[PDB]
Design a protein around this nucleic acid. Structure first.
Lengths: 130, 123, 90, 99, 103, 129, 85
DNA sequence: GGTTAAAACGCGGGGGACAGCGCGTACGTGCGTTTAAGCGGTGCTAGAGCTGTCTACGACCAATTGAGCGGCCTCGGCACC
DNA sequence: GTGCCGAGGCCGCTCAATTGGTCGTAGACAGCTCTAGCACCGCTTAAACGCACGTACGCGCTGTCCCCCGCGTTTTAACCG
């Protein structure tokens, strides 16, 4: 290509974005700009943001999913912050990745130690009462 | 239907109320660009019949931003160790294997490789 | 006495479970899937006949399961074998 | 007037009651009768819960097929036609109630 | 044209390469055996028959001649269990949305 | 810029319906099979694209499970032994493939408590139960 | 008596044996230990090594190197916080 | 000459017959609930027109994958200290 | 003398390697449906109108496994077809 003339019809995608080329939903262009904005390297490759968005999209899908499943068990159709915490603590892989993460405005797993329940029919040692 | 100019239109918002019909736009707010319109897209693909509150969306907005810092931060350290000036899918793939757990990394690599392949192969 | 009523149910054909409690039971299950679900009178009765004969076949097999183990009574062990061996539960 | 999922009147012209644990509708005489139709002389006491549990498992599977069949046509009422289509898939087929 | 050896061009209602292409994408470095291709090819054919077999019933009962994604959506729920259908519908729905936005 | 109804830039398979939406599995064959097989008197274009994605997902998961099973067997090649292991391991796959027999497959090493030493006991240790 | 004369394939992880745990215990200010520690320490150590080598091999594999350098171990150790000087 | 099954009859348990106790039933009544009707009101499902982008049809050629081959690493097995 | 530790070794597992015709992706110009607008009654909706069935309390008989307890079953052996 030369002469600075009009190349003609745009065979390459015009309405479709770069994410639509790979079928992803998250904006690869924003991730591409963020890498340069964040000064993570002198130059950034073309496949660097594409892979990053796919990983982020998959992580978003798994988390929402698990959160949505917990929401159904709580009879609420809106995913509240407590629903995310239940999924985080239930899944070992998510627990390892988000061990030190704090979820604002609620979220706690109902963990009860076996010591808290005596369950000896309140029968003391060698006699039922004290 | 107009032809704009580059010189005087930078931050062209209201300064003095010389307006007709609609009032002047307020001063532009610092763009806190968020994945809210994208996270909701994925939510409706796996659970189309479930809603989402803004409080949990603020968590996801902070989650992706903080997660993106870790994965890109590790990749940034990786480039210096290898004396590499460029970052591409290869370094991030290894960084995923480092930061993410075992099964989680494999799924991310599997889908990531498929997504990268469709971008390169297609025009 | 228990075998006396065997003749009654094996000679006369009739529904053996209460009508509306079955209707209430299927309603409560259907409401969880979709609220305000409308059930036709024929549809609920059609499921009842299938449900009744489903257990009759199950109760028929469990009877032969008991006689296999030198037994007359059917126990929870019998129902586990019949469902699993048929592929219904495992 | 207008109505969505239903119960459009409201006010004092409608009444619904909470149904939570109506599985117990299949009681001892009802459970034994089906056992009697199976020709068993003696049935244990613990299978009464299991028989109700088995019925719940049987009903939950056929309801999914019937509801999905009904939701395909977006009809609020579950007709007898959709039930027999569901019955055919599960193997347990009943002749009648539509054809 | 046909004077040369040509009679052996037929059949090929199978998914050998398509499964192979998916196999490499899902698992980068792995091998498959010609024996294992036979089980996979027949399994896909039965799966295709199962979902389309149900979809024939839905079309006939609803007085609808055409076959669309909505009827197939019903078939996926009817055939696959809850967990399997959940991922199946997401992949299927994403296929339609991207196809309509691509040209 | 005037090209009539459609331009003459390309007139022979400018991209395929398969891989148009990032789909590997064929859609023309599925579209042809949907109409060649008398499933219905008419077929819609939305049917094959949805069906192709469904087939891809089912194929991908079992291959991933078999591939991991093959890795546990120290063999890179996928053998029907691993395919049988993956199907039987998960109850979800058991329901779909209930009456199906896989050639050159196998059977899960299941043993009851009464088929081993001691009268009826199943303590054992790790790598069992 | 009691005697074995097989070197490899059977004494890799168990090479710590009894005294080495006591040797490390004294540096840890432990007066006495129970015999059950000799089994966890093999598992506890192995988990620590496995986590480090998983990252270290990943660094070595990414750098297209067949040899694990000393600096490679530092990279794996830095992420978990157990930095080495 | 060794392996399983098969005769003889171990052997301490599991079941029916020996017995209670506690329910769940399922007939008379009245009041609205839900399923069927009675007839529209725009919205979707199937009728063709025009000339084009795609699948089916059809061609050869060098390369491309999967059979098999030969050394090796792994396994069950008998015999001394 | 026993059980499990091993050593040598036997065919296939995974890599390559040169030749015939199988399959897939690019290219044209002929009919047909893809998908897009419009019709009028038919299938499903809400809100009344009636009609026996269904819940709550009655008198009754029905059963399961507790204890003590036989003799026919199918394992445990060392020796033949």
């Amino acid at each position: 290509m030369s002469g600075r003339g009009k190349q003609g019809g745009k065979t390459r995608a015009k309405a479709k974005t770069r994410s639509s080329r790979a079928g992803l939903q998250f904006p690869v262009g924003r991730v591409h700009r963020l890498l340069r904005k964040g000064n993570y390297a002198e130059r950034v490759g073309a496949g660097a943001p594409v892979y990053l968005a796919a990983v982020l999209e998959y992580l978003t899908a798994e988390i929402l999913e698990l959160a949505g499943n917990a929401a159904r068990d709580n009879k609420k159709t809106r995913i509240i912050p407590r629903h995310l915490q239940l999924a985080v603590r239930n899944d070992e892989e998510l627990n390892k990745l988000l061990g030190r993460v704090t979820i604002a405005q609620g979220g706690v797993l109902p963990n009860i130690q076996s010591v808290l329940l005596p369950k000896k029919t309140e029968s003391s040692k060698s006699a039922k009462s004290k | 239907m107009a032809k704009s100019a580059p010189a005087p239109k930078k931050g062209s918002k209201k300064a003095v109320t010389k307006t007709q019909k609609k009032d002047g736009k307020k001063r532009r707010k610092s763009r806190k660009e968020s994945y809210a319109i994208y996270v909701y897209k994925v939510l409706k693909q796996v659970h189309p019949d479930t809603g989402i509150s803004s409080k949990a969306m603020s968590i996801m907005n902070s989650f992706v931003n903080d997660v993106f810092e870790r994965i890109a931060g590790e990749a940034s350290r990786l480039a210096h160790y290898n004396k590499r000036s460029t970052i591409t899918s290869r370094e991030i793939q290894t960084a995923v294997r480092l930061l993410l757990p075992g099964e989680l990394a494999k799924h991310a690599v599997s889908e990531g490789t498929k997504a990268v392949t469709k971008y390169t192969s297609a025009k | 006495v228990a075998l006396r009523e065997i003749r009654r149910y094996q000679k006369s054909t009739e529904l053996l479970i209460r009508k509306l409690p079955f209707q209430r039971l299927v309603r409560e299950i259907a409401q969880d899937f979709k609220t305000d679900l409308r059930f036709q009178s024929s549809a609920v009765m059609a499921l009842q006949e299938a449900s009744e004969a489903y257990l009759v076949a199950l109760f028929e097999d469990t009877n032969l399961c008991a006689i296999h183990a030198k037994r007359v009574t059917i126990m929870p062990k019998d129902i586990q074998l019949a469902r699993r061996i048929r592929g219904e539960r495992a | 007037g207008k109505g969505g999922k239903g119960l459009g009147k409201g006010g004092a012209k409608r009444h619904r009651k909470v149904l939570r644990d109506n599985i117990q509708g299949i009681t001892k005489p009802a459970i034994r009768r089906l056992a009697r139709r199976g020709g068993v002389k003696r049935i244990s006491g613990l299978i009464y819960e299991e028989t109700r549990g088995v019925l719940k498992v049987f009903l939950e599977n056929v309801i999914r097929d019937a509801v999905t069949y009904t939701e395909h046509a977006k009809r609020k009422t579950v007709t007898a036609m959709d039930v027999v289509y569901a019955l055919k898939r599960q193997g347990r087929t009943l002749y009648g109630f539509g054809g």
